[PDB]
Nucleic acid binder design. Sequence first.
DNA 1: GAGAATCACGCGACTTTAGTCGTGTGAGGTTCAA
DNA 2: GAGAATCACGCGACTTTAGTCGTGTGAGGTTCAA
DNA 3: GAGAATCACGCGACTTTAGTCGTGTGAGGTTCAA
DNA 4: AGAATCACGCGACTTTAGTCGTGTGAGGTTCAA
Lengths: 141, 139, 135, 139
Amino acid sequence: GSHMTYVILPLEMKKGRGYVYQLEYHLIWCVKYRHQVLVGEVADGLKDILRDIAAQNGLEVITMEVMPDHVHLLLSATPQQAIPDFVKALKGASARRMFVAYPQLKEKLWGGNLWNPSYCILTVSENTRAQIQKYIESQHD
Amino acid sequence: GSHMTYVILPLEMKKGRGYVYQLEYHLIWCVKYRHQVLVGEVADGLKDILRDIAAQNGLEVITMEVMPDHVHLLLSATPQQAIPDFVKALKGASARRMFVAYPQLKEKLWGGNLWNPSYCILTVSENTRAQIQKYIESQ
Amino acid sequence: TYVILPLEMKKGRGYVYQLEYHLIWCVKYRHQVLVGEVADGLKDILRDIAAQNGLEVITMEVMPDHVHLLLSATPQQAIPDFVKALKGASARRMFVAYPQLKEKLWGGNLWNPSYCILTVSENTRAQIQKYIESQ
Amino acid sequence: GSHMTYVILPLEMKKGRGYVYQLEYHLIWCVKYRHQVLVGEVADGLKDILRDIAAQNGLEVITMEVMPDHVHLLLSATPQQAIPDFVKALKGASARRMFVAYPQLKEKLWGGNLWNPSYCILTVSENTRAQIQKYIESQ
DNA sequence: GAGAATCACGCGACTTTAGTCGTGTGAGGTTCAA
DNA sequence: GAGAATCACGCGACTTTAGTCGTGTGAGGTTCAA
DNA sequence: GAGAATCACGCGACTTTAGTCGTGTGAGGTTCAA
DNA sequence: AGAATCACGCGACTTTAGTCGTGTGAGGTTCAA
Ligand SMILES: [Mg+2]
Ligand SMILES: [Mg+2]
Ligand SMILES: [Mg+2]
Ligand SMILES: [Mg+2]
């Protein structure tokens, strides 16, 4: 026999002047020519640089994984932080700082680019789209 | 007793000049003073207005539910479509058009506002943050 | 602050439940015979058996060499019993309705003697465990 | 335009004579009259009893939480283990053993029942139903 | 004041030989929601 | 590439009185992965 | 052998004043998939 | 007894009205998605 039940859960979302939000993004990008250079101290240095850039731009880093040829970040941002801006900030500044800190990168990357010119980004929720859709439907009546 | 099986999962994404993406947002906002005015043809008129605005701004509507005192939207956008810009377009233009199309709203909303000044927005994924974090960890 | 999430369930005399199973089984020898009208007939037969046994079919997909079913059941409906009901009866009926199946299946079996079954929930196990901790 | 992504992910499953399966259940039940007696050593004793019964019956305990007035179990079973049978084994035997081990429970429960006569049970999967259905479509 | 999953009473099966499971039904009997 | 879920043979229960479920075991007998 | 996200060349905008983002196009120039 | 929500201030820009951006404070159409 059909029976709708309910569950109570604590809602911990971020608040701002005229907005309440919870915005997370899975951002991915590769090394130019997919060169496997992000290893050892180079990988460690990149993490420090990224976390610094994130802090400077008020971006919260949830998850950061550096693979030899690409990076995976899960960031939390405000509604005012446009995607292209923070991607540029992260990739552009890190490329600059990385070449300075690790000139040896120029051995495989002498064309003036550390990163692939493309980025991959997906919105991330705690639960799923389908689950959110049911929540919305349950709001009627 | 267990054996590790593995399956293939499909994921629909969009492509642009220098980016691959899948961006969806759950946007919510209420009626000013939380007045239950979004009912009957008022609600239907709002849906038509919102879909028009969305289409004009190149925003894909995944879900649109209009409750008496608030609206729930699920939108799909490009990386170049900033949040405040589309929220403004949606709320601002709809408030204007709604008052012109349904002047009777002024009975309970005479202060020049149809919408509460605040909006609530959440990023949306087909998989859970936990699942995604597990995926990331499996390199 | 607080959010009220919905959860659809069923009720019986002394129990509240939500039981769904993803059931899978293949054709004997993995022959690709479930095509065209044979596939359509199978679906009719399976829905009928499901109805006769009070099993709700949520999803059903018939591939040339195997079947996928997502069923809803009561706590009292034991797995082996409904799997037997679905496979045994469908095998019988299919052979009568489609004697052409005997071309590649003459040994008296339409189905592989094994079945695959997984329990299914609306939320992941991880989500459920998180809810459990919040109690 | 669109881009179609495909990711590979693991899935644990058990094998038996004529079946391959992964069956988990979230079982819940409350104390009779919802009395908050499952505390301290009483709660601890219950856990030992439940794990013993589960082991005696070949049921694997994935998660077990004992609140003052109810119990949450996440069990893993074979296709042959019928729900009513294992619910009876767990609640019935624990009620019996608990009263003998902790006679003090009789203070609030003198009617011969430790448990509410009802039980709640849900099938559990590692992935969500929507994802599973989505998979079924991909084949 | 009143229903059920939850309270109470009936019943059969079966382990735990007590106190659940299966189960129909009604009333103020230790209950009020996981 | 031979072991099993899947092939084969045995067994009892029970619906579909055929061909599954329950089940142990071994060989080359229509199989090869959902 | 030849397309783009990824390789290359064009182009503003703006930080990191270098090397991204925005962006159109095309060719065998350090690339081949998160 | 505060703020997201109520009110008053303020540019920017569409919808030239009523949002977005935004700081502050008072009790003045509000009380939670
Ligand atoms: Mg670029
Ligand atoms: Mg605002
Ligand atoms: Mg079998
Ligand atoms: Mg009972």
